[PDB]
Ligand SMILES: *C/C=C(C)/C=C/C=C(C)/C=C/C1=C(C)CCCC1(C)C
Ligand SMILES: *C/C=C(C)/C=C/C=C(C)/C=C/C1=C(C)CCCC1(C)C
């Protein structure tokens with residue numbers, strides 16, 4: 189298409205699509221209730237991402253926001269993706285270690301604030317206030333990362349959790365950086381590079397993460 | 411009002427309203443926890459539909475979307491209705507057969523994708539892409555219908571489930587057809603007829619379904 | 633700022649922010665699963681309110697709606713706040729008395745209708761219909777208040793529930809009054825006074841409520 193980031197949106201679409209199909213196939217014939225939870229969560233995540241990547245590719249998930257005296261292209265569909273996929277990823281982690289309901293609520297609530305404030309930040313027309321929202325969102329992320337380390341271990345699941353939590357902490361922490369330097373923030377990195385960066389992170393955090401989880405038998409019970 | 415479909419919106423409003431009141435009355439004095447689940451779900455469904463039918467009647471739930479070089483009237487409030495009511499109907503089915511959490515998640519997740527992509531399709535300005543979204547939404551529906559047959563039987567509930575699943579499969583499958591031929595899609599059937607069609611389906615799938623469920627003592631325990 | 637209600641938005645922001653921090657601090661070192669539920673719910677409520685108060689302060693959460701032949705300032709962010717915070721407050725009450733799932737569903741569903749129809753009412757351009765939505769929303773509120781009295785007692789929790797339910801019934805019942813007389817409704821009270829009123833109610837219903845709950849050991853188990 190006419191926007192140079194189209195190739196990364198097309199690639200993200202294809203990779204989320206393939207990942208979804210792969211997880212769909214791998215989860216066929218799974219009878220264990222706990223495994224069924226993990227396959228459902230883990231397959232949904234790339235399915236959702238697939239749809240939102242497609243919406244970006246086709247132009248539906250893009251809006252123009254005026255700030256700094258110009259029209260800035262903002263892919264709002266990312267936030268629609270993240271709104272559902274990030275709590276689902278936390279839920280995968282949380283179920284893995286049999287987190288109590290209270291901790292799950294805290295995680296999901298904090299995550300909604302993170303994404304919600306991120307979206308407000310992304311759509312805010314007063315440039316300086318965009319970063320206020322960024323800071324609030326980042327505080328919520330830090331709370332999530334804090335809980336992931338200090339807020340939950342059954343030896344069925346201990347080592348897989350530890351790996352998935354580390355992947356999670358590393359990949360998630362990059363998102364606020366990318367937003368801060370990209371088109372939503374300071375605008376030091378052009379939109380095509382920012383889209384490439386989010387695409388690598390997204391596929392890694394969704395399909396990558398899923399592969400690690402759905403390859404470990406921490407999800408199965410004999 | 412000035413739009414010929416108003417009569418079907420008025421009738422849908424009245425029928426959802428009456429259905430809600432009826433279920434509200436029938437659920438008074440119900441003490442059994444499991445029955446309370448089914449009455450709550452089943453009463454909420456038409457209550458929600460009532461509100462969205464009203465919004466359509468009054469014009470709030472209607473927007474104009476440009477595609478094919480014209481302004482097309484699109485009732486977006488349908489998707490707001492379906493977003494909550496369709497997962498609730500799946501939940502009624504799922505609770506009936508004591509589905510595990512993983513299957514519930516899969517159903518609700520697939521359903522959100524179905525409705526979500528349907529809405530994107532309904533609001534997409536590039537005509538040809540409207541049908542891409544339709545296809546994705548239909549794939550999600552097919553997955554739901556697949557799970558309803560192959561993805562879950564306690565003899566308390568077996569025969570009522572089978573009836574409700576068949577009603578569900580027949581009525582739900584018509585929605586993508588109606589959308590495809592109506593004002594959101596190919597535009598072969600005028601909006602008034604499409605509204606009539608959705609109204610018959612909606613009342614059948616919500617009030618009709620509810621009557622069957624809430625008349626069978628598959629929901630009660632002595 | 634240029635809008636006279638800014639002081640009440642600034643004060644609400646500060647008070648929700650401080651309340652969140654206070655509950656965050658009080659919940660540190662809490663190990664009991666049930667207490668963890670109540671701290672998570674109760675801390676999230678003001679955190680969410682904080683974000684939406686901020687959005688109003690900064691102007692993001694304000695839109696202009698034409699009705700009565702003029703442009704009316706409508707703070708839509710209130711509904712975004714209430715959408716999440718009101719069900720969470722009901723959930724606190726419901727968990728306290730070990731409500732069954734069916735009653736929880738009914739409460740949360742009714743609450744969504746209340747807020748949803750409130751928002752439709754707030755954004756409706758035909759003046760007279762604004763009050764139709766108000767009435768539907770108020771009916772949903774009345775149903776909630778009905779369930780809070782007749783729809784659920786374990787002596788661990790009985791007396792704290794009774795206090796929190798009374799605070800809830802008194803404060804919540806004022807919201808429809810304020811909306812009816814304020815800028816969203818009949819317009820007899822200017823927006824600055826209405827904002828002041830909602831701010832007093834909000835802080836009382838969120839931070840006030842939370843203090844009562846999180847000070848009673850009805851949430852702890854030895
Ligand atoms: C698959 C997608 C994932 C795991 C996305 C994660 C996204 C984040 C952790 C985003 C975080 C943000 C902030 C902490 C600051 C504001 C900007 C956001 C929303 C990008
Ligand atoms: C009470 C309302 C019900 C049960 C509505 C069900 C709606 C559907 C099954 C809609 C399905 C659609 C597709 C599968 C294709 C795209 C268009 C939709 C959203 C109408």
Ligand SMILES: *C/C=C(C)/C=C/C=C(C)/C=C/C1=C(C)CCCC1(C)C
Nearest residue numbers: 750766769770773804807808811837
């Ligand atoms: C912390 C915020 C709380 C507890 C807010 C509660 C809000 C209500 C009970 C609002 C009720 C409304 C009606 C019943 C009528 C229509 C207008 C509303 C949404 C203000």
